[PDB]
Design a protein around this ligand. Structure first.
Ligand SMILES: [Mg+2]
Length: 223
């Protein structure tokens, strides 16, 4: 049940992929790669980077995986060029799906809901002032098309019931994304603009943002 997957291509090789900037207030806890392009590595801030012997990638105690930037040694820039392209294709693939299963459901106020599989369209912002559940099997899919902002209020949680998998939940979001302090998010974010995870928030999925990403001592576990 639910729509055909959004293929991330090589954007699925990153925990975080951004074009303008990635900032962390330590101590963030990122499982997977961090890439920035076309911006340079000086727009990776707060990571206390060490450049590794080849000059092609850097390391941080905040990241289990490699950081890469567009100014790094060959062939890193070509790799990120492809990843940024594949994120653009993924966003458009998700945003342009037609025939939604749910249209303006709950007016985009998702507190206390249980969301079954399908294609969701909101011509609005989406927020949640309370915990909500995504409920489906390990093979079901969700695509959440959001014309405005996406938020999850402080300390609130998305629960996966039934076997539902974060990698099968795509948030395709035109406006800014704000996960508030201590909130627990589930799914891949394909953001057209900025994504911010505030103090002690966590995301099981990926952050694939066409502008900036801001982390405040936040957890990103790639799914
Ligand atoms: Mg609500």
């Amino acid at each position: 049940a639910g729509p055909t997957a959004v293929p991330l291509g090589t954007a699925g090789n990153y925990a975080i992929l951004a074009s303008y900037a990635v900032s962390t207030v330590p101590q963030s806890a990122i499982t997977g790669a961090v890439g920035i392009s076309p911006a340079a590595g000086t727009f990776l801030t707060g990571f206390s980077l060490t450049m590794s012997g080849t000059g092609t990638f850097s390391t941080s105690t905040q990241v289990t995986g490699q950081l890469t930037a567009a100014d790094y040694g060959t062939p890193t820039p070509s790799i990120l060029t492809t990843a940024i392209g594949d994120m653009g294709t993924a966003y458009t693939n998700g945003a342009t799906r037609s025939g939604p299963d749910f249209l303006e459901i709950y007016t985009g106020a998702l507190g206390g809901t249980t969301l079954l599989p399908g294609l969701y369209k909101w011509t609005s912002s989406v927020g949640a002032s309370a915990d909500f559940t995504i409920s489906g099997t390990s093979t079901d899919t969700w695509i959440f098309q959001i014309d405005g902002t996406l938020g999850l209020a402080a300390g609130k949680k998305i629960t996966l019931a039934g076997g539902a998998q974060a990698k099968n939940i795509i948030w395709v979001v035109a406006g800014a994304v704000s996960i508030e302090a201590g909130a627990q998010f589930e799914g891949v974010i394909l953001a057209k603009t900025a994504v911010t995870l505030k103090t002690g928030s966590s995301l099981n999925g990926r952050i694939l943002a066409q502008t900036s990403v801001a982390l405040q001592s936040a957890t990103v576990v790639q799914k």
